[PDB]
Design a protein around this ligand. Structure first.
Ligand SMILES: Nc1nc2c(ncn2[C@@H]2O[C@H](COP(=O)(O)OP(=O)(O)O)[C@@H](O)[C@H]2O)c(=O)[nH]1
Length: 227
């Protein structure tokens, strides 16, 4: 209902998280306690390498099965990292925009009611990923889903979420300047002005957060295990 329907069909789950925020992009709530579970930390190419290294050992130390990967990693390498049992049947699960379609497409690759596809050794993978929508109870979670592009900028009505998101960004990257200074500067630098040469702060926020989520603002992670 409806990930609960799909879980019934599988014995293996691949949890596709964003490496920049492994906790905000975890599939909390939904139950994989009786499935073989691989934690996939994705988008390592746009994450802070050192932070990602900390996340790996954090999961390994917990006894958990964890891998890291990104768009540009070869299909062969991903498959080896995955190392699926020959009798695995697989659900790819996660929050929106975390790289699940891209992963399915690479595995697929492409070759040929709920649909499946098969790997060369016959392991079966569900063609469509289970999409997980979270109760956003904290503005911190909303901010973190914004930063990784799970929560699109068009959906943000509350300016406090933008502020929390910046505050997380700023701490991660080392910025000590204020919300106002930073966004005025960003609007200026990118020529985002309205009549009278007034910095368009709203366009600024929209472009900046779009760019952060795409990894265009640098290799930055938003959660640390330390923490
Ligand atoms: N930099 C980077 N971008 C990625 C990676 N995987 C996916 N993306 C991008 O993330 C966005 C969402 O990817 P998509 O596969 O459609 O996400 P989905 O909603 O989970 O299926 C797209 O803009 C992709 O181009 C990755 O490993 N690295």
């Amino acid at each position: 209902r409806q990930i609960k329907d799909l879980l019934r069909l599988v014995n293996t789950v691949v949890e596709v998280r964003d490496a920049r925020a492994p906790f905000a992009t975890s599939a909390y709530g939904v139950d994989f306690s009786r499935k073989e579970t691989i934690i996939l930390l994705n988008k390592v190419d746009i994450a802070d390498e050192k932070t990602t290294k900390k996340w790996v050992e954090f999961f390994k130390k917990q006894g958990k099965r964890v891998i890291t990967t990104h768009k540009g990693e070869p299909r062969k390498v991903l498959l080896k990292k995955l190392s699926f049992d020959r009798l695995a049947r697989v659900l790819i699960v996660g929050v929106p925009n975390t790289g699940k379609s891209t992963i399915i497409n690479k595995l697929k690759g492409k070759r040929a009611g709920i649909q499946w596809f098969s790997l060369e050794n016959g392991v079966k993978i569900l063609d469509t990923p289970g999409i997980l929508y979270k109760n956003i109870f904290s503005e911190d979670l909303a901010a973190k889903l914004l930063l990784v592009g799970s929560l699109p900028v068009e959906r943000i009505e509350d300016q406090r979420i933008f502020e929390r998101a910046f505050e997380i960004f700023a701490r991660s990257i080392g910025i000590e300047s204020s919300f106002s200074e930073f966004f005025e500067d960003f609007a200026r630098k990118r020529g985002l002005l309205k009549k009278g040469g007034v910095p368009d702060i709203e366009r600024a926020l929209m472009l900046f957060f779009t760019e952060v989520a795409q990894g265009k603002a640098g290799r930055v992670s938003f959660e640390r295990p330390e923490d």
